[PDB]
């Protein structure tokens, strides 16, 4: 007997435990939206005495917690199921409520819903249903168990008219199962009256899984009041069983001087509610106010890159054996190609990536104008010298790295790559020099150092020592003097026609629509239209005086376009006295109705309220 009715005002609860008085504190949390569909689900298993195959007990998703209200006599509804598929592939829970006990536990049972539903199990003949669980019939690795006191206080309201209105709110944000609840029998029989009542907390404990679906435990050996039907499409049918789905909303909440919640408003229902939320009060005087600011959102995305094809020789530069010395390195330039950065870090994790400006994961999307590659082998200890502003024996006379270096430096061990019993005398480094090296140039020079006041003419005697020192590697010594093959990738982001991009698909060119565009790395959103500009053959980008791009030539079509921002403006609410009327009149600042406010579409208008037919 599924049915659909209105929820009205229901679901307010204390979000914390601190005491407050005469405060208008506002919060942003999971709540039950005002005036929402509340649907009576109905697990239907009772008819005479026979089996009555029913295919009922539908899987109810546990979406952002659930609001559960009930008027249950004693124990017909007992417990609940949370988990995924309840088998030996995903962890499962067990939450069963005794008379006064709780037996929550964790297990991976494949099947547990076999309580041997009897033919004579109808309560009209006998209501005896004890230990009708037959749960965790299988347990491969089930260890996490738990016991505690009952959550619901099983109290009888001594009559059916003033039945015990039982309310729970279930949420599992970062573990710590919340069971905020409240009992109230004041209702005289009707469903969901008008009023206010906050809900107190009970307990919270952490377990941790992707809990996905929900279903209450019924007394499978004692059932009644569930007739068979297929009611739907906003109808009415007795079920004695409720459900409600929460959403993350912002609420304004008032506290009585005793400390009890008295009233609350949801900021995202009515322009009047928005006005009441913006200024902290429940009465708004006649006038005009500002509430929010709407803006149209993009509908899709497009990427257009040149038609370049060719794999950059990153394999050639990385894999080699005849790298030269530190003082005399080698420089290489990357030509027009597309570069696959996946093999750099996703494979062969030898040493740290040591990124400085760009992150390795954020690669393969941005595009570059040129790439430099340098290779040398150094001290294992001198690795830290390769960093901006860092000084050392080689950081001043062998290799200087600029302050604002961008890109990454790649190094890996070379114990096998370079080890001679007699030592390696083919590796050199400059030791003495007149001045500190400016970044990125060579100081190679065949000359004898002149120290003191001895003008050596090639004597190379006292106070005249060779600046280049034969490094002399070792095959058996420990780390540090062990060889480290070092390569450095130097990028630059210069506003020029891009040369080397990542691997991306070039989609079609849409126009006259609010879309997201990426023209060789110019991220942004707007409406691409025709342009009448007179771009010269070497011109690439247009510009207004803001350092803001407003004209882009198509890369693979050689056609210029115009870029315009999305429709944008503020929102105003015109209302009379709040004690005179409740109607309003929304003003959309500086926009034409024909552009977009003539109708609201799904997720295309920041103001949530759309109570107008527009």
């Amino acid at each position: 007997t599924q049915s659909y009715t209105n929820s009205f005002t229901r679901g307010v609860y204390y979000p914390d435990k601190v005491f407050r008085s005469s405060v208008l504190h506002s919060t942003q949390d999971l709540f039950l939206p005002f005036f929402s569909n509340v649907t009576w689900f109905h697990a239907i298993h009772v008819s005479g005495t026979n089996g009555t195959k029913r295919f009922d007990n539908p899987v109810l998703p546990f979406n952002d917690g659930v609001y559960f209200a009930s008027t249950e006599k004693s124990n017909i509804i007992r417990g609940w199921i949370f988990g995924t598929t309840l088998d030996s592939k995903t962890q499962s829970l067990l939450i069963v409520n005794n008379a006064t006990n709780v037996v929550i536990k964790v297990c991976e049972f494949q099947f547990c819903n076999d309580p041997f539903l009897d033919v004579y199990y109808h309560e009209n003949n006998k209501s005896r249903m004890e230990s009708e669980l037959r749960v965790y019939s299988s347990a491969n690795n089930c260890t996490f168990e738990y016991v505690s006191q009952p959550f619901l206080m099983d109290l009888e309201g001594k009559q059916g008219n003033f039945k015990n209105l039982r309310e729970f709110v279930f949420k599992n944000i970062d573990g710590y199962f919340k069971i905020y609840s409240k009992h109230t029998p004041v209702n005289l029989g009707r469903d969901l009256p008008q009023g206010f009542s906050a809900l107190e907390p009970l307990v919270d404990l952490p377990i941790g899984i992707n809990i996905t679906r929900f279903q209450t435990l019924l007394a499978l050996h004692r059932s009644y009041l569930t007739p068979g039907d297929s009611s739907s499409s906003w109808t009415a049918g007795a079920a004695a069983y409720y459900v409600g789905y929460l959403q993350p909303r912002t609420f304004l909440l008032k506290y009585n001087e005793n400390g009890t919640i008295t009233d609350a408003v949801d900021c995202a229902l009515d322009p009047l509610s928005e006005t009441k939320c913006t200024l902290k009060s429940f009465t708004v005087e006649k006038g005009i106010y500002q509430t929010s600011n709407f803006r149209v959102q993009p509908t899709e995305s497009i990427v257009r890159f040149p038609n370049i094809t060719n794999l950059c020789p990153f394999h050639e530069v990385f894999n080699a054996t005849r790298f030269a010395s530190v003082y005399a390195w080698n420089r290489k330039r990357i030509s027009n190609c597309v570069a696959d950065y996946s093999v750099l870090y996703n494979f062969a994790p030898f040493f740290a990536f040591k990124c400085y400006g760009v992150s390795p994961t954020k690669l393969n999307d941005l595009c570059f104008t040129n790439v430099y590659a340098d290779s040398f082998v150094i001290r294992g200890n001198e690795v830290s010298q390769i960093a901006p502003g860092q000084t050392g024996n080689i950081a001043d006379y062998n290799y200087k790295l600029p302050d604002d270096f961008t890109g990454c430096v790649i190094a890996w061990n070379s114990n096998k790559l370079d080890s001679k019993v007699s030592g390696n005398y083919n590796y050199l480094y400059r030791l003495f020099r007149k001045s500190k090296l400016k970044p990125f140039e060579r100081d190679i020079s065949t000359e004898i150092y002149q120290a003191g006041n001895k003008p050596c003419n090639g004597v190379a005697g006292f106070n005249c020592y060779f600046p280049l020192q034969s490094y002399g590697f070792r095959p058996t010594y420990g780390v540090g003097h062990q060889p480290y093959r070092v390569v450095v990738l130097s990028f630059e982001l210069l506003h020029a026609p891009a040369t080397v991009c990542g691997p991306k698909k070039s989609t079609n060119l849409v126009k006259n629509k609010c879309v997201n565009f990426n023209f060789n790395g110019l991220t942004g959103t707007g409406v691409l239209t025709e342009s009448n500009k007179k771009f010269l053959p070497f011109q690439q980008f247009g510009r207004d005086i803001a350092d803001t791009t407003d004209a882009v030539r198509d890369p693979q079509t050689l056609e210029i376009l115009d870029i315009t921002p999305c429709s944008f403006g503020g929102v105003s609410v015109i209302t009379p006295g709040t004690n005179t009327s409740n109607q309003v009149a929304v003003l959309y600042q500086g926009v034409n109705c024909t552009e977009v406010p003539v109708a609201i579409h799904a997720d295309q208008l920041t103001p949530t309220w759309r109570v107008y037919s527009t």
Partner: antibody
Amino acid sequence: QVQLVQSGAEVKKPGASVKVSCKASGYPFTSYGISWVRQAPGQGLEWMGWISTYNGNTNYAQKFQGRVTMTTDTSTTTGYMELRRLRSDDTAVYYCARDYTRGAWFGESLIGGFDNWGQGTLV
Amino acid sequence: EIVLTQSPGTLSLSPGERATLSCRASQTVSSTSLAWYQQKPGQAPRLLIYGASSRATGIPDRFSGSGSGTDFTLTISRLEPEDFAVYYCQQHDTSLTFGGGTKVEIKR
């Protein structure tokens, strides 16, 4: 996920040339070169040759200068061996391997050996 | 050029005994030149050791290597006789020439 396959056995008379196709798939045929090597019973292998991807640069040994000229087709993704001036008893198995010892553009040698080999063509 | 010289003439050992292999060169081979292969009968070569002690195709517990400069040695412990492949060694720094080789028999 290397895929290297070779054609069947071939017999050619002296004075002609032997053309054998080595098909490569599953890996990009530009990161590493392909080395062709020869094996005969009772003895090890040699430095028959190594072939690059984009151009004709090679690392031919000092034994067979003037004859060793193979080709590669990146469109066909096939290494073609076209050994000319056949010798009387050149009958031996040929292995095309994804080499890890020679570099393509600037000619600098690599590190290691021959990781993945071919299935072998017997002539 | 330089041709390798091998004198592990016969590995006449039963499974379970230690096996040692040597690949002494002529005059010098630098440590950045090493390759080792198993030549199974009627099969294709495959790389096992491309350096000092690294792994190419699995190598759970058997293929080990060490050495420095003029000496290089390969060690096998607890050998399982399914392979009985030829131990081939190769240097790279001085041109390229495969080693003599060493057949591995069963010793029934």
